[PDB]
Amino acid sequence: GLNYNQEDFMGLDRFFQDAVSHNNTDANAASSIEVEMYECDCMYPTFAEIARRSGQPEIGAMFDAIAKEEGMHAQLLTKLYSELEVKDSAETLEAKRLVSTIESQIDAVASDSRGLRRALETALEVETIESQKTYPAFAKLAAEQGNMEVATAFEAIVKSETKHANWVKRALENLLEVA
Ligand SMILES: [Fe+3]
Ligand SMILES: [Fe+3]
């Protein structure tokens, strides 16, 4: 065989960040807020710039639209936990550093067709994990704990992240269709 799994081109897969599981729903909300704001603030704007600089403005507009919706998810949870003090974990700080190293190479990243391909594939990876695993698990726990309002919020976030996965897949299919 190859003898190893190659890491993705330019480390773009490490843009994906997952919320951390806890026993307590306030802490799951805090972790979600953290990650969703990182995607709103940092991840998706960077993907949008890769798209634009690759000559793909429509896909860039999609990433800008998704970014705003990640902020909506965070703001719903903030409304429910008004007093929470959310801080970036080590892993979010590392991801923000990575974002800044791609920004300072943005021209090279975009000029290679893998830049945008891997950005879309990383978006798909997070939207998949969020929609199918992480936020269903948070919704289930919140319900178990009798926290109906927060369970309902996570169920709405699940719906939205599922939509994003669909958007991203359709965009990937078109990106890769030349004609
Ligand atoms: Fe998200
Ligand atoms: Fe999303």
Curated annotation (Swiss-Prot):
Q: Does the keyword Plastid apply?
A: yes
Enumerate the InterPro entries for this protein. Ferritin-like, Ferritin-like_diiron, Ferritin-like_SF, Rbr2/Nigerythrin, Rr_diiron-bd_dom
Instruction: Tell me the cofactors it needs.
Output: Fe(3+)
Disulfide-bond pairs as recorded: none
**Cross-link named 3-(L-phenylalan-2'-yl)-L-valine (Phe-Val), where?**
16-126
Q: Which UniProt keywords apply?
A: Cyanelle, Iron, Metal-binding, Plastid
Q: Organism's domain of life? A: Eukaryota
Could you say which residues bind Fe(3+) 2 here? 70, 127, 161, 164
The record's subcellular locations are: Plastid, Cyanelle
Q: Where is the Ferritin-like diiron domain?
A: 20-179
Q: Give coiled-coil spans as residue ranges.
A: none
Q: Function, please? A: Exhibits oxidase-like and peroxidase-like activities in vitro.
Quote the PANTHER family the UniProt record gives. RUBRERYTHRIN
**What is this protein's record name?**
Symerythrin
Record organism? Cyanophora paradoxa
